[PDB]
Amino acid sequence: EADQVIENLQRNELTPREIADFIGRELAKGKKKGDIAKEIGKSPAFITQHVTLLDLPEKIADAFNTGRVRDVTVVNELVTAFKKRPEEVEAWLDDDTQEITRGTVKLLREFLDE
Amino acid sequence: YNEADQVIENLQRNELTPREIADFIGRELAKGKKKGDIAKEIGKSPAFITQHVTLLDLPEKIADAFNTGRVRDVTVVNELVTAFKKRPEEVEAWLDDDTQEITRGTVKLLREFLDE
DNA sequence: CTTTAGCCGCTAAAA
DNA sequence: ATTTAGCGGCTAAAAG
């Protein structure tokens, strides 16, 4: 350990959250994001995408935990948007009929920028 | 050391080229297995089977685009072949121009132009 | 050493 | 038992 972890990962047997948790433990040991990327054979962006999952704003976390959003990239785009305009993002999410895709999130961010 | 168990493993390690997966599907087809069953034995979709069987018999000019790394997107290959079956010379010409950028956006435009 | 833009893998549902 | 439609992983390049 964490060889089995890195191995399991390179065998794609891991969820996004498991990968995020592994990353969190490596950070807590003092490793840098960039060196974690190299030890698991992935990009720096892959590290950013998963670290985000460790500390989601509550509304986004609930959307992700219920399977209402399953696209990690979309989770990241919602968190980015949320950091700038949190009230409006929550309100967008608060409509339960609002379909969540890369497209609808792009329209949301184009509207908020604007 | 069984072939299909290995293919499953090497699949999940992303260590098989499209050509290797296609080759394995062809070997299963020649042993009399049905596409839909080959999908189930490797835990992939029937569509995945289609996409790869296509690579076993590519028209020469699409095969060149692929073998030469000019198109690496297996889906785009399949889209090129589909367009080609319908309107061969028009697809060949479009490919014969080596300036042509090849993406899904660009293939999609070609097909829109063709279907009218 | 995190964001945007986007290719590409894949399969759900459709044809 | 193919094809279209489009979601979703992973990242090069652009931005910081």
- State the best of B5, B6, B8, B12 to mutate against chain A, taking most chain A CBs within 10 Å: B12
* Cα A68 to Cα A19, A55, A59, A64, distances in angstroms: 20, 18, 11, 6
Which CATH number applies to A57-114?
6.10.250.140
Q: Quick one: CATH architecture of A1-56?
A: Orthogonal Bundle (1.10)
Chain B residues in contact with A13 (beta carbon < 8 A): 12
Distance, in Å, from the CA atom of A46 to the CA atom of A52, rounded to the nearest integer, reads 10
- State the best of A9, A12, A14, A40 to mutate against chain B, taking most chain B CBs within 10 Å: A12
The 10 Å CB-count burial string (b at 16+, else e) for A20-53 is bbbbeebeeeeeeeeebbeebebeeebbebbbbb
Distance, in Å, from the CA atom of B65 to the CA atom of B72, rounded to the nearest integer, reads 8
Return the CATH fold of B1-58: Arc Repressor Mutant, subunit A (1.10.10)
* Method of structure determination: X-ray
**Among all residues of chain B, which has the CA nearest to that of A11?**
B13
Domain parsing of chain A, residue ranges: 1-56, 57-114
**CA-based angle B109:B113:B116, to the nearest 5?**
140
Kindly report the backbone phi and psi dihedral angles of residue B85, in degrees, each rounded to the nearest multiple of 5, phi listed first. -50, -35
Distance, in Å, from the CA atom of A54 to the CA atom of A21, rounded to the nearest integer, reads 7
Q: Do A10 and B12 touch (CB under 8 A)?
A: no
Euclidean distance between the first and the last CA atom of chain B, given in angstroms as a whole number: 52
Return the CATH fold of B59-116: 6.10.250
Say what the alpha-carbon torsion angle B63, B69, B71, B75 is, to the nearest 10 degrees: 80
B86 is written with which tokens? 């319908």
